[PDB]
């Protein structure tokens, strides 16, 4: 049955709630982003209205074959009316097409659902700035002070410089980047750009990327692996066996692989700076795990909440254990006492 933290009180609405069958009293289903833990349950047989971003709607139509008549894309940063309730979609700084949802309830309550997000100070100047928010349904993935990670910019700088140095030293090295869902496209695109190559990938992955409105994409991606020196593979294949096997397949075009695994966080973060990151190496294969996050760090999350000053916080992540819930609730209280709301 649908959990309480996916239901919006005083509306017929649910958020990311497609795996529970027909939810009692739900008149419209919102989807924040195209990641499987959130869309789980959608298909061509779905006949309720789905409300989402334009990019998310392209992916529902093309990847899951949801029929067009049930897809309701909304423009970002625009006041829209859904079953008599004003809503706004805001950029979540997560994967492409990912949104936060503002709901203006008929009784005057205002609710922000962040979906998945990486908090940023740029959000303090959207339509959020213009009114009070009473309830916040918060992406608490990394809600503990041990979760620190660098900016996305520093991590891409590291990756570009590492790939450029390696291929310049050896023009017969191949670069491989792991992927398993949309998000983190800057990793592979930035590396292909510095090397003057396109990124080569499966037809299925190319189809997914063509759904995303990324400018000049026909310019950076391809299905012709032979013409590319940056290849994308499934995240599961980013290990020494899987990469040795791939290198065989390239027919003696290459004699070395440098691979990147973008992770969220890893406890090497508690001790090491990005500048200091080193690979795991075996023979002619090196693997770099880089901390490219599309979720808020603890400090980013804290700053956002202390800016927004909500009356009530409802965590949507890590809610399954009493120890996690208690830990999160203690931080929410700290934040409120420190900021004075
Ligand atoms: Ni996500």
Pairing of the two strands 99-104 and 85-91: antiparallel
Between the CA of 72 and the centroid of ligand 1 the distance, in Å, is: 20
Query: How far is it, in rounded angstroms, from Cα 127 to Cα 85?
Result: 17
Between the CA of 11 and the centroid of ligand 1 the distance, in Å, is: 24
Between the CA of 35 and the centroid of ligand 1 the distance, in Å, is: 5
Do 141 and 197 lie in one domain? The reply is no
Q: What is the CA radius of gyration of the chain?
A: 22
Do 254 and 318 lie in one domain? The reply is no
Our CA angle for 116, 122, 123, nearest 5°, is 50
User: Are residues 259 and 290 in contact, defined by beta-carbon separation less than 8 angstroms?
Assistant: no
Q: CB burial class (10 A; 0-12, 13-18, 19+) of residue 86?
A: middle
Query: How far is it, in rounded angstroms, from Cα 316 to Cα 115?
Result: 8
Do 76 and 201 lie in one domain? The reply is no
User: Are residues 71 and 57 in contact, defined by beta-carbon separation less than 8 angstroms?
Assistant: yes
**What's the domain range around 37?**
1-147+296-341
Between the CA of 106 and the centroid of ligand 1 the distance, in Å, is: 30
Domain count across the chain: 2
Between the CA of 256 and the centroid of ligand 1 the distance, in Å, is: 33
**According to the 3-state scheme, what is the secondary structure of the chain?**
CCCHHHEECCCCEEECCCCCCCCCCCCEEECCCCCHHHHCCCCCCCCCCEEEEHHHHHHHHHHCCCCHHHEEEECCCCCEEECCEEEEEEECCCCCCCEEEEEECCCCCEEEECCCCCCCHHHHHCHHHHCCCCEEEECCCCCCCCCCCCCHHHHHHHHHHHHHHHHHHCCCEEEEEEECCCCCHHHHHHHHHHHCCCEECCHHHHHHHHCCCCCCHHHHEECCHHHCCEEEEEHHHCCHHHHHHHHHHCCCCCCEEEEEEECCCCHHHHCCCHHHCCCEEECCEEEEEECCCCCCCHHHHHHHHHHHCCCEEEECCCCCCHHHHHHHHHHHHHHHHHHCC
Between the CA of 92 and the centroid of ligand 1 the distance, in Å, is: 10
Identify the CATH number of the domain in which residue 222 sits: 3.40.50.12650
Q: How far is CA 41 from CA 12, 45, 252, in A?
A: 19, 10, 44
Identify the CATH number of the domain in which residue 121 sits: 3.60.15.10
Tell me how crowded residue 201 is: count the other CB atoms within 10 A of its CB. 23
Do 290 and 304 lie in one domain? The reply is no
Between the CA of 119 and the centroid of ligand 1 the distance, in Å, is: 14
Tell me how crowded residue 116 is: count the other CB atoms within 10 A of its CB. 25
Q: Among 64, 56, 63, which residue's Cα sits nearest to residue 91? A: 56
Query: How far is it, in rounded angstroms, from Cα 95 to Cα 34?
Result: 8
Between the CA of 285 and the centroid of ligand 1 the distance, in Å, is: 30
Query: How far is it, in rounded angstroms, from Cα 57 to Cα 174?
Result: 35
Do 289 and 303 lie in one domain? The reply is no
- Angular region, 22: left φ>0, alpha ψ -120 to 50, beta rest: beta
Method used to obtain the model: X-ray
Do 227 and 251 lie in one domain? The reply is yes
Between the CA of 83 and the centroid of ligand 1 the distance, in Å, is: 27
Do 143 and 2 lie in one domain? The reply is yes
Between the CA of 95 and the centroid of ligand 1 the distance, in Å, is: 7
Experimental resolution (Å): 1.7
User: Are residues 265 and 86 in contact, defined by beta-carbon separation less than 8 angstroms?
Assistant: no
Do 288 and 331 lie in one domain? The reply is no
Between the CA of 175 and the centroid of ligand 1 the distance, in Å, is: 26
Between the CA of 116 and the centroid of ligand 1 the distance, in Å, is: 5
């Amino acid at each position: 049955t649908c959990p309480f933290y996916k239901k919006i009180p005083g509306t017929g609405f649910t958020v990311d709630a497609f795996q529970y069958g027909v939810v009692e009293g739900c008149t419209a289903y919102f989807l924040t982003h195209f990641h499987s833990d959130h869309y789980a349950g959608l298909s061509k047989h779905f006949t309720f209205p789905v409300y989402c971003s334009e990019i998310t709607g392209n992916l529902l139509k093309n990847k899951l074959h949801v029929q067009e008549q049930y897809i309701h894309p909304l423009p970002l940063d625009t006041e829209c009316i859904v079953n008599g309730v004003k809503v706004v979609l805001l950029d979540a700084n997560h994967c492409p097409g990912a949104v936060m949802i503002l709901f203006y309830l008929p009784n005057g309550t205002v609710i922000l659902h962040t979906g998945d997000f990486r908090a940023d100070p740029s959000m303090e100047r959207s339509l959020l700035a213009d009114q009070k928010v009473h309830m916040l349904y918060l992406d608490t993935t990394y809600c503990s002070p041990e979760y620190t990670f660098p900016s996305q910019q520093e991590v891409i700088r590291f990756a570009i410089n590492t790939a450029f140095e390696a291929v310049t030293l050896n023009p017969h090295a191949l670069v491989v980047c792991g992927t398993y869902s949309i998000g983190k496209e800057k990793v592979f695109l930035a590396i292909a750009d510095v090397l003057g190559s396109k990124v080569g990938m499966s037809q299925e992955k190319y189809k997914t990327l063509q759904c995303l409105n990324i400018p000049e994409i026909n310019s950076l991606i391809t299905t012709d692996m032979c013409s590319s020196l940056v290849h994308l593979l499934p995240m599961m294949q980013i290990n020494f066996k899987g990469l040795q096997s791939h290198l065989k397949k390239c027919g003696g075009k290459y004699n070395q692989i440098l691979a990147f695994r973008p992770t969220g966080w890893t406890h090497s973060n508690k001790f090491t700076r990005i500048a200091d990151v080193i690979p795991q190496t075996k023979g002619n294969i090196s693997i770099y795990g880089i901390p490219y996050s599309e979720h808020s760090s603890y400090l980013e999350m804290k700053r956002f909440v202390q800016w927004l000053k909500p009356q009530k916080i409802i965590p949507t992540v890590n809610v399954g254990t009493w120890k996690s819930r208690s830990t999160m609730e203690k931080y929410f209280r700290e934040w409120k006492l420190e900021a004075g709301y």
